Amino acid sequence: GILTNKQAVARHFGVKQSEVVYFSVGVDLGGYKVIYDKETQRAYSLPVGIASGTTAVSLSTAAVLVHSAGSVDLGSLAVSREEYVTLPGSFDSGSTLNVKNELLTYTDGKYRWDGIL
Amino acid sequence: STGILTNKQAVARHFGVKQSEVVYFSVGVDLGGYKVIYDKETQRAYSLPVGIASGTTAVSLSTAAVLVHSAGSVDLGSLAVSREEYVTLPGSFDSGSTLNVKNELLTYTDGKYRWDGIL
């Protein structure tokens, strides 16, 4: 269940299965490369340099990860790394954007929202 | 076990090929007919050059993804580069990093780069 998911996620980002961690309150973030949110079913590369013993506090729907040492917008990090999710539909169909790394397809290409989520 | 099969499935979906077209590397494995090869140690997958005859067996696979088989050799990293099949490494230039394959990209503030020199 979880193991096959870490496999899919790891193969997507090109990391090791053991380098993927699921978010949960208190989870230790040290050494992990990709975090996975089970609720939204989204994965995000983690910022490098998170010390062992750094534990997770909260993960918002906008992918803002708060931990014991501070916080980081995984959406903005994902954009910096060009790691995107292309939402179903389009501007024609309409949609709701929740994260900075979500793209909405228009007639002339894709767009991401840089404002209030 | 199922672990091998589900990983072959994750790899196949990633590359858009059939599950059966994925082969784990092992000294002696028959490479013929496969489209993608997986290195269980480094946990990286690479498209295989089309044309490998049946009977062609694997000899060695370096951390630079150089594959030696009974009929020849091929840089899988170079092949991946030509196919835009890349791995964006964790971190960036600022954080520092170590690159081992031609298809690895490091992120800088103005975009990504791959290393075309000595690995």
CSV table of C-alpha atoms in Angstrom, one decimal:
chain,number,residue,atom,x,y,z
A,1,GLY,CA,0.0,0.0,0.0
A,2,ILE,CA,2.3,2.7,1.3
A,3,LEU,CA,5.4,0.9,0.0
A,4,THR,CA,4.1,0.7,-3.6
A,5,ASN,CA,3.3,4.4,-3.4
A,6,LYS,CA,6.7,5.4,-2.2
A,7,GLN,CA,7.9,3.3,-5.3
A,8,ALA,CA,5.7,5.3,-7.7
A,9,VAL,CA,6.7,8.6,-6.1
A,10,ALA,CA,10.4,7.8,-6.0
A,11,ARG,CA,10.4,6.7,-9.7
A,12,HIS,CA,8.7,10.0,-10.5
A,13,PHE,CA,11.4,12.2,-8.8
A,14,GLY,CA,14.3,9.9,-9.5
A,15,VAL,CA,15.1,9.2,-5.8
A,16,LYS,CA,15.3,6.1,-3.6
A,17,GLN,CA,12.2,4.6,-2.1
A,18,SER,CA,13.8,5.1,1.3
A,19,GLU,CA,14.1,8.8,0.4
A,20,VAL,CA,10.4,9.4,0.4
A,21,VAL,CA,8.5,10.2,3.6
A,22,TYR,CA,4.7,10.5,4.2
A,23,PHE,CA,3.6,13.6,6.1
A,24,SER,CA,2.1,13.1,9.5
A,25,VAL,CA,2.3,15.2,12.7
A,26,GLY,CA,5.7,14.7,14.3
A,27,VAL,CA,7.3,12.8,11.4
A,28,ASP,CA,11.1,13.1,11.3
A,29,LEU,CA,12.2,15.0,8.1
A,30,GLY,CA,15.9,14.4,8.3
A,31,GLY,CA,17.5,13.0,5.2
A,32,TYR,CA,14.3,12.6,3.2
A,33,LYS,CA,14.2,14.0,-0.4
A,34,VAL,CA,10.5,13.9,-1.2
A,35,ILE,CA,7.5,14.3,1.0
A,36,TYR,CA,4.0,13.0,0.2
A,37,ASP,CA,0.7,14.4,1.5
A,38,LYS,CA,-1.8,11.5,1.8
A,39,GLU,CA,-4.9,13.7,1.9
A,40,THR,CA,-4.3,15.8,-1.3
A,41,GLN,CA,-2.2,12.8,-2.8
A,42,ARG,CA,0.5,15.2,-3.9
A,43,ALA,CA,4.3,14.9,-3.7
A,44,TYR,CA,6.9,17.6,-3.2
A,45,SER,CA,10.7,17.7,-3.3
A,46,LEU,CA,12.0,18.7,0.2
A,47,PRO,CA,14.5,21.5,0.8
A,48,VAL,CA,18.0,20.2,1.4
A,49,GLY,CA,19.7,20.6,4.7
A,50,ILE,CA,16.9,19.6,7.1
A,51,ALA,CA,18.6,18.5,10.3
A,52,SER,CA,18.0,15.0,11.9
A,53,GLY,CA,15.5,15.5,14.7
A,54,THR,CA,13.5,18.1,12.7
A,55,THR,CA,9.9,17.0,13.0
A,56,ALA,CA,6.8,18.0,11.0
A,57,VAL,CA,4.1,20.1,12.5
A,58,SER,CA,1.6,20.9,9.7
A,59,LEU,CA,1.2,20.7,5.9
A,60,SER,CA,-1.5,23.0,4.5
A,61,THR,CA,-3.5,22.5,1.3
A,62,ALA,CA,-1.3,25.2,-0.3
A,63,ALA,CA,1.7,22.8,0.5
A,64,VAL,CA,3.2,25.1,3.2
A,65,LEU,CA,5.2,22.7,5.4
A,66,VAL,CA,5.7,23.8,9.0
A,67,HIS,CA,8.3,21.9,11.0
A,68,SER,CA,10.2,22.3,14.4
A,69,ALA,CA,12.9,24.3,12.8
A,70,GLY,CA,10.7,26.7,10.7
A,71,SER,CA,8.7,26.4,7.5
A,72,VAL,CA,8.9,26.2,3.8
A,73,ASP,CA,6.4,26.7,0.9
A,74,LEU,CA,6.8,23.4,-1.0
A,75,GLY,CA,4.8,24.9,-3.9
A,76,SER,CA,7.4,27.7,-4.4
A,77,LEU,CA,10.2,25.2,-4.1
A,78,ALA,CA,8.5,23.0,-6.7
A,79,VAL,CA,8.2,26.0,-9.1
A,80,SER,CA,12.0,26.7,-8.6
A,81,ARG,CA,12.7,23.1,-9.6
A,82,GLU,CA,10.1,23.1,-12.4
A,83,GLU,CA,8.2,20.3,-10.8
A,84,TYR,CA,4.5,20.9,-11.7
A,85,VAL,CA,1.1,19.3,-11.7
A,86,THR,CA,-1.1,20.1,-14.7
A,87,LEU,CA,-4.7,20.3,-13.4
A,88,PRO,CA,-7.5,18.5,-15.2
A,89,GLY,CA,-9.6,20.8,-17.4
A,90,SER,CA,-8.7,24.3,-18.5
A,91,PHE,CA,-9.6,28.0,-18.4
A,92,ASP,CA,-12.6,27.0,-20.5
A,93,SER,CA,-13.8,24.3,-18.0
A,94,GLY,CA,-12.7,26.4,-15.0
A,95,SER,CA,-10.9,25.0,-11.9
A,96,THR,CA,-9.6,25.8,-8.5
A,97,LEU,CA,-5.9,26.3,-7.9
A,98,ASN,CA,-4.5,25.5,-4.4
A,99,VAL,CA,-0.7,25.2,-4.9
A,100,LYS,CA,2.0,27.4,-6.5
A,101,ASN,CA,3.1,24.4,-8.7
A,102,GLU,CA,-0.3,23.7,-10.3
A,103,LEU,CA,-0.7,24.7,-13.9
A,104,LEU,CA,-3.9,25.5,-15.7
A,105,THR,CA,-4.0,25.0,-19.5
A,106,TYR,CA,-5.2,27.8,-21.7
A,107,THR,CA,-5.5,27.9,-25.5
A,108,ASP,CA,-1.9,29.3,-25.9
A,109,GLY,CA,-0.1,27.3,-23.2
A,110,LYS,CA,0.0,26.7,-19.4
A,111,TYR,CA,-0.1,29.2,-16.5
A,112,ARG,CA,0.5,29.1,-12.8
A,113,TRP,CA,-1.1,31.5,-10.2
A,114,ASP,CA,1.3,33.8,-8.4
A,115,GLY,CA,-1.3,35.4,-6.1
A,116,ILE,CA,-3.6,34.6,-3.2
A,117,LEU,CA,-4.4,30.9,-2.9
B,1,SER,CA,8.5,-10.5,-5.4
B,2,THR,CA,5.5,-8.3,-5.9
B,3,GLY,CA,8.0,-5.5,-4.9
B,4,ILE,CA,9.9,-6.1,-8.2
B,5,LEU,CA,6.6,-6.2,-10.2
B,6,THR,CA,5.1,-3.1,-8.7
B,7,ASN,CA,8.4,-1.2,-9.2
B,8,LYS,CA,8.5,-2.4,-12.8
B,9,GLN,CA,4.9,-1.0,-13.0
B,10,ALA,CA,6.0,2.4,-11.6
B,11,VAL,CA,8.9,2.6,-14.0
B,12,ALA,CA,6.8,1.6,-17.0
B,13,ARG,CA,4.1,4.2,-16.3
B,14,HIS,CA,6.9,6.8,-15.9
B,15,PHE,CA,8.4,6.0,-19.3
B,16,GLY,CA,5.1,5.1,-21.0
B,17,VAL,CA,6.1,1.6,-21.8
B,18,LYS,CA,4.7,-1.9,-21.0
B,19,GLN,CA,5.5,-3.4,-17.6
B,20,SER,CA,7.1,-6.4,-19.3
B,21,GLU,CA,9.5,-4.0,-21.2
B,22,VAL,CA,11.4,-3.2,-17.9
B,23,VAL,CA,14.4,-5.3,-16.8
B,24,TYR,CA,16.4,-5.1,-13.6
B,25,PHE,CA,20.2,-5.1,-14.2
B,26,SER,CA,22.1,-8.2,-13.0
B,27,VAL,CA,25.3,-9.7,-14.4
B,28,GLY,CA,24.1,-12.1,-17.1
B,29,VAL,CA,20.5,-11.0,-17.6
B,30,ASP,CA,19.2,-11.3,-21.1
B,31,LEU,CA,18.7,-7.7,-22.4
B,32,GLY,CA,17.0,-8.5,-25.7
B,33,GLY,CA,13.6,-6.9,-26.3
B,34,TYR,CA,13.6,-4.7,-23.2
B,35,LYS,CA,13.0,-0.9,-23.6
B,36,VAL,CA,14.0,0.2,-20.1
B,37,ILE,CA,16.6,-1.0,-17.6
B,38,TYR,CA,16.6,-0.5,-13.8
B,39,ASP,CA,19.6,-0.3,-11.5
B,40,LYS,CA,18.4,-1.6,-8.1
B,41,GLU,CA,21.5,-0.2,-6.3
B,42,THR,CA,21.3,3.4,-7.5
B,43,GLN,CA,17.5,3.1,-8.0
B,44,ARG,CA,17.6,4.8,-11.4
B,45,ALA,CA,15.9,3.7,-14.7
B,46,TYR,CA,17.2,4.3,-18.2
B,47,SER,CA,15.7,3.8,-21.7
B,48,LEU,CA,17.6,1.1,-23.6
B,49,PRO,CA,18.9,1.5,-27.1
B,50,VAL,CA,16.6,-0.1,-29.6
B,51,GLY,CA,18.1,-3.1,-31.5
B,52,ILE,CA,19.7,-5.2,-28.7
B,53,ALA,CA,19.5,-8.7,-30.1
B,54,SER,CA,18.1,-11.6,-28.0
B,55,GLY,CA,20.9,-13.5,-26.3
B,56,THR,CA,22.7,-10.3,-25.5
B,57,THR,CA,23.5,-10.5,-21.8
B,58,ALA,CA,24.5,-7.8,-19.3
B,59,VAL,CA,28.1,-7.6,-18.0
B,60,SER,CA,28.3,-4.5,-15.9
B,61,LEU,CA,26.6,-1.2,-15.1
B,62,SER,CA,28.5,1.7,-13.6
B,63,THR,CA,27.3,4.5,-11.3
B,64,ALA,CA,27.7,6.7,-14.4
B,65,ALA,CA,25.2,4.4,-16.1
B,66,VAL,CA,27.6,2.9,-18.6
B,67,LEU,CA,26.2,-0.5,-19.6
B,68,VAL,CA,28.5,-3.2,-20.9
B,69,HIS,CA,26.9,-6.2,-22.5
B,70,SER,CA,28.1,-9.3,-24.5
B,71,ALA,CA,27.7,-7.5,-27.8
B,72,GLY,CA,29.0,-4.1,-27.0
B,73,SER,CA,28.7,-1.0,-24.8
B,74,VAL,CA,26.5,2.0,-24.4
B,75,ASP,CA,26.4,5.2,-22.3
B,76,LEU,CA,22.8,5.2,-21.0
B,77,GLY,CA,23.4,8.6,-19.5
B,78,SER,CA,24.2,10.1,-22.9
B,79,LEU,CA,21.2,8.3,-24.4
B,80,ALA,CA,18.9,9.7,-21.7
B,81,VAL,CA,20.3,13.2,-22.4
B,82,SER,CA,19.3,12.9,-26.1
B,83,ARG,CA,15.9,11.8,-25.0
B,84,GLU,CA,15.4,14.6,-22.4
B,85,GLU,CA,14.9,11.9,-19.7
B,86,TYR,CA,16.3,13.7,-16.7
B,87,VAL,CA,16.7,13.5,-13.0
B,88,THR,CA,16.6,16.9,-11.2
B,89,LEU,CA,18.9,16.4,-8.2
B,90,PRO,CA,17.8,17.6,-4.7
B,91,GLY,CA,19.1,21.0,-3.7
B,92,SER,CA,21.0,23.4,-6.0
B,93,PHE,CA,24.3,25.0,-6.8
B,94,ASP,CA,24.1,27.1,-3.6
B,95,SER,CA,23.6,24.1,-1.4
B,96,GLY,CA,26.2,22.2,-3.3
B,97,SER,CA,25.8,18.6,-4.7
B,98,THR,CA,27.5,15.7,-6.4
B,99,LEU,CA,26.7,14.6,-9.9
B,100,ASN,CA,27.3,11.0,-11.1
B,101,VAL,CA,25.3,10.8,-14.4
B,102,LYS,CA,25.0,12.8,-17.6
B,103,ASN,CA,21.2,12.9,-17.2
B,104,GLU,CA,21.4,14.6,-13.8
B,105,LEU,CA,20.4,18.3,-13.6
B,106,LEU,CA,21.4,20.8,-10.9
B,107,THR,CA,19.2,23.8,-10.3
B,108,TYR,CA,20.7,27.3,-10.3
B,109,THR,CA,18.7,30.5,-9.8
B,110,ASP,CA,18.3,31.1,-13.5
B,111,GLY,CA,17.5,27.5,-14.5
B,112,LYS,CA,18.8,23.9,-14.7
B,113,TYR,CA,22.2,22.6,-15.9
B,114,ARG,CA,23.7,19.3,-16.7
B,115,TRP,CA,27.5,18.5,-16.5
B,116,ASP,CA,29.2,17.7,-19.8
B,117,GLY,CA,32.6,17.1,-18.3
B,118,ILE,CA,34.4,14.4,-16.2
B,119,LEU,CA,32.1,12.5,-13.9
